[PDB]
Design a protein around this ligand. Structure first.
Ligand SMILES: Nc1ncnc2c1ncn2[C@@H]1O[C@H](COP(=O)(O)OP(=O)(O)OP(=O)(O)O)[C@@H](O)[C@H]1O
Ligand SMILES: [Mg+2]
Lengths: 382, 232, 48, 237, 236, 255, 249
């Protein structure tokens, strides 16, 4: 298949309605990604972008081992301008977790001539487009498009084409658009497939005002904004929930997770409204103190380890506990314990609730009541 | 990094400076009443203590609100150095982290305004009807003495049918005096603290103004450089 | 309750002042506007 | 280095001081070769001409290469294209910053901007990783509070934050170290602190074992036994 | 659209989503064509291209092409030349802010970021303007007190400030409206309110004439002549 | 305009707005491929706006005594005045009226920033009546823009500055006036005398308009002579000033 | 200077100032249509200065033992050392003496910012008698700066010592004192023996003490001159007069 091949149009698509389960609490619960979406993973150097994309890639082996080609999300990872040793570490990571059997890694590394860095994302999109067009689902990670833009800048300036902003050529938007827009979800007339794009961008100093950032932020359906100030506070992944936004939104969230994520989002919005006084939490009003406490505990509740995606059945009870206010009694430092212990209890007890949050995917009132029961019981034991 | 960011940073620091400057003036306005409530109570105290000159629990008095600088910190330092009943949320907070089992009684809400004999008397009345301060050898009052418009010192004054009624009374009178001197010290400390804060804000504004100018020059140079590369 | 007794008598003598004679200081001298909580944590909040 | 790696099979370590001068060199000539300059003024080939150099510096099944590269940052702007491009090529990156050096804290390594791939509980072990994470959290808390400190004074901070700030000040300063080669311009004799001793000492500091010790004793000592020794010395003198 | 105006003989409204990309593609084509790039990278023909697009959107003897133009503001910087040039042609601004959706106030129009030139008494009338000015003053007062209400409890407010705050919340929620296209989304019957029937309603709210009733009764109603009905249902 | 200027007539030229003239010349120059300068504007833009503006002049009785007054408008982006075109035009003009959005949104219209606004010439031109009566207005308004940051606070408000907070509030309510309703000097100076002399203190801030509309009637009917002399003769001689004090105190005793 | 360097003689070259040389090369380059870079300077404004300052060298006796020392001057806009040309010359040179306007206007002249000032040759060039005495004064004052900055927000000992050290270093224009005269004072400075002297008295000390050693102690200055390094016996004979005069003072 050709590298530059026209993206599908309006008619053949169908609306994004099914989830790309990343297993990262901070994403599935606040900035969800659906099969067909385009989500910008934008952040400064070493702020965790590849880690988000790779946790997403790794999680899928819960579904990709089974029987239904509908749940399986095959992955393509385009490494542009990276060093070959980093790709070797990446394939070693994917091999440790067995995720290579359903991942394709396309490498135009820094030493590869500039034309191949400019072209590699297009050919990886053509690879994923096969899965898209043949009734399967795919996920393509561009790591990263800033370096593709630099390669295209080298190409253009050495072709004596005129520069525009930031010395980038006048048609880099057309480049990234005719690249990304090929990510789509198709309709039953065309095979029900999808291809989801997780483009990375390397913002210098967090400046979303640069040219390539300004373009990609507008091309994509949303952005996961990784920040260093959050990273160093142990909020990892360092997702600035405020700056992060998804236009598909609830249509992508798992039902059970949408139910609780609405309230999670509302409480964190209140927390962001109050945050300017977070360091003065003592003397503040009763309601402001309640919102500071709960916002801090929720922000902590989202942090999770590298290479460890939680399934939705483990996210839902946990976000429920955070929202409904059970964790308000737990010291901020012990929350990391609460999760690792609490989930174990839900397997030692109330296993039906997890099993059905997975099977049904929906928190029926019965399941919500039993979940409240289990949460009360463990916060009593805790 | 970019011009808009330095501009919003500078605008926030300017708003902080404005707020602290307004707070200084408000504190200076309240100081006028705090001074007189202190003067009257100082005369009343000297009059009552003339009797102790001729003839002969720890109540820690502070405010409920912060931004007083070192007021609460210095009074808690004095308490621990000497070492309980707390008046004010802040001293209560300072002590609750160190001796939770020692706080017997906490009073809140009196820190917002000058003390009145009603407040002192009812606080003493809770000490006598709840804490049962009766016949305790251990009774003293720790409070701030306002030394100047720019300084305050943590201080202690001891506490001691009329021979009993006089203790039951000087409890309220000395508590009033301590709350009044603590209110004057708190107001003065806040005036000084907000003035210092506004001066520091002006200094930070100067620094970020240097940075705004430098970023303006750099922005223009970069933009015109790119344009000139284009015009080749 | 000697200081307490004087406080009650003072509220009497203050309310006894003519409404056309009370300065704001008098209405203030009646406003305790304070609370107390026994005390580890507070078993009971109440007015003071 | 490549021959020592591939044809001789030995373990090699390759010091490059300073690699920025490579890219800058390519810049100086780029205008005279007739290229349209890129961003702030670097040559278009910056991303590729660097790689062909940088990609050769690597470990291989023929031989191992341990490379330590100095990467000048012009105008201290880490956003300058050359450092920004170099950062992608390095497993471990220690960013020396001017602000820390103005604070007299040599070796001036920004405890936060500095990062390494091998700082993972899998490689360094869980204790080391928890210690490092607590250190980074404490220093970032200090840097976040710095504005409240600068305006409202430290006394406005709560006990948890006053303690965190004093501990951050102790830690940023305990990261200082005298180098045996720096003695000819610092006087202080050089120190080598082993890894386990560093982990344990910073653990002891985080756990509050030495809240009693003043800051000045954490400066330029080396290990924590030398923190104690300098404390005893300040107390004696 | 202009054919529906000129030959069809009736008013039509034109949706341009998004005009930022008109300006963006103009800059792309200008950079490609070799025109010296201007400020941040936009074309020199920015203002004249925008004018040649917009000024066809206007009223005339046979009708009017109205335009509702989505305007993407890059990096939220209204001072970028693209939005700055778009702003010179539009005279009504409707800001859909997520912060208004957090409060659940759908259709999530920011009552204060949104502004219009036609709000002048000369066009809407002095009554409409007095009512809208009272609404804006109350909501700006609430937004100003939003910091103090967090630092200090609402009990610290003066009764008049507390009243302005409560009537501000009630005004906020009376501004919410069920859309008719969204009746399938959540079932709500989706009412639409005339302008006069809106001024007369926010007036009755502002004067304290309808302060008797609770906050949630103002939610998603098509007039005070329906808020009283909802409140009668709730009280019953 | 130069025609009215040279032939002995007075003119007024309103450029709305020169930022767009600068943009137009920038396009015109960039397409002519002329070398650009700061902000992509051509080098001589200062020459553009100077050549345009300072044609405005007041001529000698020997050249015709005519005049031309230039009121160039500039749209500042986000209130930034350090931009290139604003930086130039602020330097070319004799003074500036700075209209502030923070005031416009508060309903203070016209939203003139009395602080940043300046007329390095017009003080010698002001109708004498208004110089007399508004001698204190600029000081009062600056004191008010200082004290107003303190408006919200309670009864602890110092009595000394309470008068500032009264007079400034009343003066701000006076200085706002509805669009398309320009007032004659004879209607201007009485209101400013009432304001500066603090007669409006006894009036509720929401009723100042009812004063300005009603007071003009009390003047027009009861004191036609005063308005007539102020307009026709041009200045407030002490006798007319006493008439003005009397009329204001009379209406205010009525109001 | 290279003629002195090469023929075995010693030279010193003061460039006053290289900011303006860089401006001149910027003019020369831009007029040649060389594409601008950072701060509109040409990309090779580094080479302009490297091939200038690298010539300042100290040679072996094979090449005649000569030397050339360079004291370049750079003007900093607004006191920012983060600018392009300043950073380039800091990268080329072996150290920096940073003179701060805040100190100069306060009257601290010469206005040496001890924190940012550093010489990477250091003690190797310093006279032996001063290395033997100063200890680690540079880092002490670098830390004193931060200690004072945070004090504004037993530290009193470091702060007192640093204030007195900063005051001790002042000097008058055109009035240089040889090393025989610097070694004495820096001992009372570094070893904190000055803590018992008020700040405003230090200007009286520096001369009076200098008069005491020169008046009585020819035996100490005529040593440190001819020897250049202190025997612990002469170091004792200096600690003695320091303690004696300071107790008198
Ligand atoms: N989930 C996590 N929690 C904590 N630390 C993490 C996590 N994931 C990655 N890291 C750490 O952060 C770094 C990962 O950088 P990452 O690859 O995610 O960014 P990147 O996209 O490579 O940015 P750049 O390409 O500029 O380096 C590593 O040092 C790694 O140890
Ligand atoms: Mg990466």
């Amino acid at each position: 298949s050709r590298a530059q091949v026209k993206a599908p149009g309006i008619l053949p698509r169908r609306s994004v309605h099914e989830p790309v389960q990343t297993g990262l609490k901070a994403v599935d619960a606040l900035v969800p990604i659906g099969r067909g979406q385009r989500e910008l993973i934008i952040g400064d150097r070493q702020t965790g972008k590849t880690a988000v994309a790779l946790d997403t890639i790794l999680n899928q082996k819960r579904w990709n081992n089974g029987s239904d080609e509908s749940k399986k999300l095959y992955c393509v990872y385009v490494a542009v301008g990276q060093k070959r040793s980093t790709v070797a570490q990446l394939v070693q990571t994917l091999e440790q977790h067995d995720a290579m059997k359903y991942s394709i890694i396309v490498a135009a590394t820094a030493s590869e001539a500039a034309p191949l860095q400019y072209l590699a994302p297009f050919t990886a999109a053509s690879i994923g487009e096969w899965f898209r067009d043949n009734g399967k689902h795919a996920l393509i990670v561009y790591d990263d498009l800033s370096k593709q833009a630099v390669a295209y800048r080298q190409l253009s300036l050495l072709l004596r084409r005129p520069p525009g902003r930031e010395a980038y050529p006048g048609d880099v938007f057309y480049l990234h658009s005719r690249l990304l827009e090929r990510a789509a979800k198709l309709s039953e007339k065309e095979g029900s497939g999808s291809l989801t794009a997780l483009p990375v961008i390397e913002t210098q100093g967090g400046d979303v005002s640069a040219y390539i950032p300004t373009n990609v932020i507008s091309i994509t359906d949303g952005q996961i904004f990784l920040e260093a100030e959050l990273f160093y506070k142990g909020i990892r992944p360092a997702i600035n929930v405020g700056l992060s936004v998804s236009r598909v939104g609830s249509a992508a969230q798992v039902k059970a997770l949408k139910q609780v994520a609405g309230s999670l989002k509302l409480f964190l919005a209140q927390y962001r409204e109050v945050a300017a006084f977070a360091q003065f939490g003592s003397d503040l009003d009763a309601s402001t103190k309640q919102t500071l406490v709960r916002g801090e505990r929720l922000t902590q509740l989202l942090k999770q380890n590298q290479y460890s995606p939680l399934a939705t059945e483990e996210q839902v009870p946990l976000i429920y506990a955070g929202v409904n206010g059970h964790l308000d009694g737990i010291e901020l430092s012990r929350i990391g314990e609460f999760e690792s212990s609490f989930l174990s209890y839900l397997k030692s007890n109330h296993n039906e609730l997890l099993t059905e949050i997975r099977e049904k995917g929906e928190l029926s009132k019965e399941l919500l009541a039993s979940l409240k029961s289990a949460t009360e019981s463990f916060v009593a034991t805790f | 990094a970019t011009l808009k960011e330095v501009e919003m940073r500078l605008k926030s620091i300017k708003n902080i400076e404005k707020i602290t400057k307004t707070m200084k003036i408000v504190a200076s306005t309240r100081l006028s009443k705090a001074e007189k409530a202190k003067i009257s109570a100082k005369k009343m105290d000297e009059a009552e203590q003339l009797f102790y000159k001729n003839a002969e629990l720890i109540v820690a008095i502070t405010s409920d609100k912060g931004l007083c600088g070192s007021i609460h910190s210095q009074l808690a330092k004095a308490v621990r150095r000497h070492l309980i009943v707390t008046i004010g949320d802040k001293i209560k907070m300072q002590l609750l982290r160190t001796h939770p089992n020692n706080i017997k009684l906490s009073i809140n809400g009196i820190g917002k305004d000058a003390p009145t004999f009603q407040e002192s008397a009812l606080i003493a009345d809770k000490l006598l009807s709840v804490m049962k301060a009766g016949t305790y050898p251990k009774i003293s009052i720790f409070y701030n003495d306002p030394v100047s418009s720019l300084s305050f010192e943590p201080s202690e004054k001891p506490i001691f049918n009329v021979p009993r009624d006089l203790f039951e009374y000087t409890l309220a009178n000395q508590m009033l005096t301590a709350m009044a001197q603590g209110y004057a010290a708190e107001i003065s400390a806040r005036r000084n603290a907000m003035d210092n804060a506004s001066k520091n804000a002006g200094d930070m504004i100067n620094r970020y103004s240097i940075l705004y100018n430098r970023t303006r020059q750099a922005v223009i140079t970069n933009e015109l450089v790119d344009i000139i590369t284009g015009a080749s | 309750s000697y200081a307490a007794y004087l406080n009650v008598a003072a509220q009497a003598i203050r309310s006894s002042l003519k409404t056309e004679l009370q300065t704001a200081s008098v209405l203030n001298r009646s406003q305790t506007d304070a609370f107390y909580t026994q005390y580890a944590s507070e078993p009971t909040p109440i007015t003071k | 280095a490549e021959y020592f790696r591939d044809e001789e099979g030995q373990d090699v370590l390759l010091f490059i001081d300073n690699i920025f001068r490579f890219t800058q060199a390519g810049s100086e000539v780029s205008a005279l070769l007739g290229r349209i300059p890129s961003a702030v003024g670097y040559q278009p080939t910056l991303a590729t001409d660097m790689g062909l150099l940088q990609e050769r510096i690597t470990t291989t099944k023929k031989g191992s290469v341990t490379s330590v590269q100095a990467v000048y940052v012009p105008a201290d702007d880490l956003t300058d294209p050359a450092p920004a491009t170099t950062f992608a090529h390095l497993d471990a990156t220690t960013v020396l910053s001017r602000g820390i050096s103005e604070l007299g804290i040599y070796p001036a390594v920004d405890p936060l901007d500095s990062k390494s791939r091998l700082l993972d509980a899998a490689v360094v072990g869980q204790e080391h990783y928890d210690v490092a994470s607590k250190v980074q959290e404490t220093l970032q808390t200090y840097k976040s509070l710095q504005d409240i400190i600068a305006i409202l004074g430290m006394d406005e901070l709560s006990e948890q934050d006053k303690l965190t700030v004093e501990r951050a000040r102790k830690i940023q300063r305990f990261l200082s170290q005298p180098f045996a080669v720096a003695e000819v311009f610092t006087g202080i004799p050089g120190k080598l602190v082993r890894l386990k001793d560093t982990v344990a000492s910073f653990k002891a500091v985080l756990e509050g074992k030495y809240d009693n010790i003043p800051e000045h004793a954490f400066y330029m000592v080396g290990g924590i036994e030398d923190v104690v020794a300098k404390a005893e010395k300040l107390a004696a003198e």
